[PDB]
């Protein structure tokens, strides 16, 4: 697999650039500085780590390294905590949009910068505690050979338990949040359509501006698309592991397929800046400013 490596490199460079661009935008332009965008910045950073770290670890583990059980389990599962943090932020954002759009009168005092701080900190902690189950002593170790004495080679499939990837990951810490996220979002959308359809039958300004509503709802859809693509990303991999696990002594997945879900899920962190540029005028204009500036500088 030559192409594969030059690939995971192309990824790292992309993800790093695009997300550094998002964070530089948010720092640079005051309009982007706000709770929603602190969670968005969390997403950016967690997707930068994958660029600088998770891909090199994706590239060592292919070549079958050998080391201490736990120090091996790190490089084995790291992108785990990243992915988890990505979910936590996505959900924080869905909820923030939910307060904003469903209960706009209490959003002012309810959602604050410092509280954003706290929820983010916490979410990172928990992204770790959950992120690597191995590190806490939960053990697939102790059951190549002559690799080493005090060193047991660490490769995902065997040194990574599939009784978790398909249970404490796919079933618990991914599908559930993703799902009540789909819920919160559909609730926002249906409700907003209801009250718009209502504002129509009663000439404005009945309660709040229709234009405003439609605008923040369009923005919510742009934000929910990010979730949709996240799902479209880790879903294939979790399907693979999913049915490969429920029939452990049944069949397994190829090289030429199985080596996708890794690439793909690794692609999940590349697209965000592009989705922003496409769906959101403030980012697009800022990226445009940063690039149109610091290029010809």
């Amino acid at each position, epitope marked *: 697999s030559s192409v594969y490596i030059t690939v995971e490199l192309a990824i790292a460079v992309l993800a790093i650039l695009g997300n550094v661009l998002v964070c530089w935008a948010v720092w640079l332009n005051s309009n982007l500085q706000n709770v929603t965008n602190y969670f968005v910045v969390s997403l950016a950073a967690a997707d930068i780590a994958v660029g600088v770290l998770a891909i090199p670890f994706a590239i060592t583990i292919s070549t079958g390294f050998c080391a201490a059980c736990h120090g091996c389990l790190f490089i084995a599962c790291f992108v785990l905590v990243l992915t988890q943090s990505s979910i936590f932020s996505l959900l924080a954002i869905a909820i923030d949009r939910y307060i904003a759009i469903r209960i706009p009168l209490r959003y002012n005092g309810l959602v604050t910068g410092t509280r954003a701080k706290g929820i983010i900190a916490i979410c990172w902690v928990l992204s770790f505690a959950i992120g690597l189950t191995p590190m806490l002593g939960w053990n697939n170790c102790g059951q190549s050979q002559g690799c080493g004495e005090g060193q047991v080679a660490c490769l995902f499939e065997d040194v990574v338990p599939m009784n978790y990837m398909v249970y404490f990951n796919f079933f618990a810490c991914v599908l559930v949040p993703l799902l009540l996220m789909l819920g919160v979002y559909l609730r926002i959308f249906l409700a907003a359509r209801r009250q718009l359809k209502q504002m129509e039958s009663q000439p404005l300004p009945g309660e709040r501006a*229709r234009s405003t509503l439609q*605008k923040e709802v369009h923005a919510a859809k742009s934000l929910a698309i990010i979730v949709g693509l996240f799902a479209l990303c880790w879903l294939p991999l979790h399907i693979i592991n999913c049915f490969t696990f429920f029939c452990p002594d049944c069949s397994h997945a190829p090289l030429w397929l199985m080596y996708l879900a890794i690439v793909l899920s690794h692609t999940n962190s590349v697209v965000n800046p592009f989705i922003y540029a496409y769906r959101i005028r403030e980012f697009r204009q800022t990226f445009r400013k940063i690039i149109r500036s610091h290029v010809l500088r």
Partner: antibody
Amino acid sequence: EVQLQQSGAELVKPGSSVKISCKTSGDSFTAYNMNWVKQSHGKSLEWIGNINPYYGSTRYNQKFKGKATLTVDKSSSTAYIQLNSLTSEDSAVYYCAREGNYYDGGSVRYFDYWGQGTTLTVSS
Amino acid sequence: DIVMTQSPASLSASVGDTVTITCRASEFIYSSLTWYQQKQGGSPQLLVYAATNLADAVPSRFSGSGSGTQFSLKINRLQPEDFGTYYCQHFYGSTWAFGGGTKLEIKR
């Protein structure tokens, strides 16, 4: 149906202070920042500052720092601006406006509702 | 602090023709710019927000546009109800400021 009803015209000697009020009816007062604008000679507008009704927290334009003082009585849904050490140059019409807020990916801001305005005349 | 500069200061025009007002910012405010309409003896009314966005019930013949440092409001087939003074305001930053206004007068 939202309405910002400002206090009536004010005529005072230079050296004195004044408190103009804006009562809000038809929505939640604590949900939006209240702003004050000064219009001079029927033309030029200037942003004086704004106040968060919930916390009473304020941001002033530098030019009016120390001249204006913003305050809120949430009980009555009423916001006040008070002007101190009045001179003729303070003679103008003062508006309270209400700030709207939403997220388009940026923070979107506007003054959607304005008061009828209040005339202040400062002369000896 | 960021400074708005609006032109022309006054413009006379006839019902039915097209008019354009310009706001120019001393810095980069991106899209955060508001247009207000004031009728004689009235209070400024919200017209455009986010530089491109028509307020509720404002007629489609109104259009906002521009970005960064440069903005324009345009009225298409002028109606008699459209004469008055227009103002720009930037919402960028912690401290805000207005254009000097454009007075739109009837040509006879």
